[PDB]
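Quick question: what would this complex look like in 3D?
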Amino acid sequence: QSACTLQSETHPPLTWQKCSSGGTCTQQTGSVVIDANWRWTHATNSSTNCYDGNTWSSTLCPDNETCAKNCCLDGAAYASTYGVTTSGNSLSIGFVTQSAQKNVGARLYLMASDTTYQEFTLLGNEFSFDVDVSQLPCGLNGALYFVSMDADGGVSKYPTNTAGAKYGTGYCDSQCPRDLKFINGQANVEGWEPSSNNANTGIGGHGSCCSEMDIWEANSISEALTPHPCTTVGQEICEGDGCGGTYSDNRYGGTCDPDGCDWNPYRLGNTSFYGPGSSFTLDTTKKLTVVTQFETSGAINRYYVQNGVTFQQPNAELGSYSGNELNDDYCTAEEAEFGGSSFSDKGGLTQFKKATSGGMVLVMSLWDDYYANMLWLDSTYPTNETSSTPGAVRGSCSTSSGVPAQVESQSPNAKVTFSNIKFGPIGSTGNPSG
Ligand SMILES: OC[C@H]1O[C@@H](O[C@H]2[C@H](O)[C@@H](O)[C@H](O)O[C@@H]2CO)[C@H](O)[C@@H](O)[C@@H]1O
Ligand SMILES: *[C@@H]1O[C@H](CO)[C@@H](O)[C@H](O)[C@H]1NC(C)=O
Ligand SMILES: *[C@@H]1O[C@H](CO)[C@@H](O)[C@H](O)[C@H]1NC(C)=O
Ligand SMILES: [Sm+3]
Ligand SMILES: [Sm+3]
Ligand SMILES: [Sm+3]
Ligand SMILES: [Sm+3]
Ligand SMILES: [Sm+3]
């Protein structure tokens, strides 16, 4: 696609900190951009939509190449249309925002400049942030994660995409998502089928795969930390049922691991660590700090801070594994106790190091789950298992929570607020800011 300026594109600002082993932290100026899919797509020369509800214009947009020549992405009104505001080092994202239409959720990327995403090399370093999940009920997911996207959004490889990172192009993740309207400089109309349960989406014939590190998927009830390796580390288009991922016949038939090796403390047996109120170690009615370290072995360490007290990730006994680090040993024990081989099939933590040792782009989003209602995160899943099944129970939510029309209409003011991002060498992010 190309870019149109009927609505100007101005990225909300957001400050973060770059920390140093020398004891100091230095303020960086970034901005956030919304993903291209949320944007208005219309004709280059006019105002006729190329896309509406969940179908494409037969006239403007009869194939993938032509439709890219005829269509463009416009600017976005972050606050009034998409419920996205920033203030200082803080970013809020609202759930349902009513304007001319009803917008649900947002996915945003941190930017280095007007035209380029900020690339973070995770391996050897740590990422810290603060989050308020108090306004996230059952069924929602305020996510902060990284993906192996190209810094320029695809522009230098696919010259039919002149819009680029400024308009949020280039997304990929380990689900090899096929709901994207534009992939690799072309549209995704060759093959489209509308969603039945969703007025606004559908599934195209192409998907966009890459490595994904889910630092934080959470609401007020449950949280999880999950790396997802792929056989090909960075962004890469896939075709149809062979994409794999959530909406293909065989979830496991693609290049990426859609399950991951997740660590959810409640799932592992600690039902009093994370939750609403002061009967939980971490009280999700209040702001908390989350620190994540990418050890050079490929292991991942986690600790939290709330109201000045530091808590390490809780210990887990899981098969033969005992500890509190997401390593090799834990991943292997998880497969053996909870089932699965997707994670080690696609290379395990070793293959995941190739992602973390190159650049990854920071993503922050809020979403609801048209496929499984977020039950995999905060409830019993699958829905007909009971706690005598290992790892079935992931949170205390009811088995009928999370249906998207339900929560869209009963908690439209849900919001997530992320703030105070700090990034630098291991052990540096507890340094004072400045
Ligand atoms: O694809 C939806 C969701 O699935 C998550 O993997 C689940 C998986 O759905 C289920 O088969 C298994 O029993 O539990 C895992 C781990 O929670 C995946 O982790 C999510 O990222 C994905 O969004
Ligand atoms: C859960 O976590 C806390 C904090 O680590 C710990 O003191 C407590 O014993 C844990 N409970 C269980 C049942 O593992
Ligand atoms: C839940 O239903 C699934 C259906 O696939 C079945 O395999 C599983 O054994 C059931 N578990 C219980 C405890 O009924
Ligand atoms: Sm391919
Ligand atoms: Sm360690
Ligand atoms: Sm080992
Ligand atoms: Sm066992
Ligand atoms: Sm195997």
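Answer marked as accepted. The helical segments are 64-70, 328-338, 342-345, 348-356, 375-378, 404-410.
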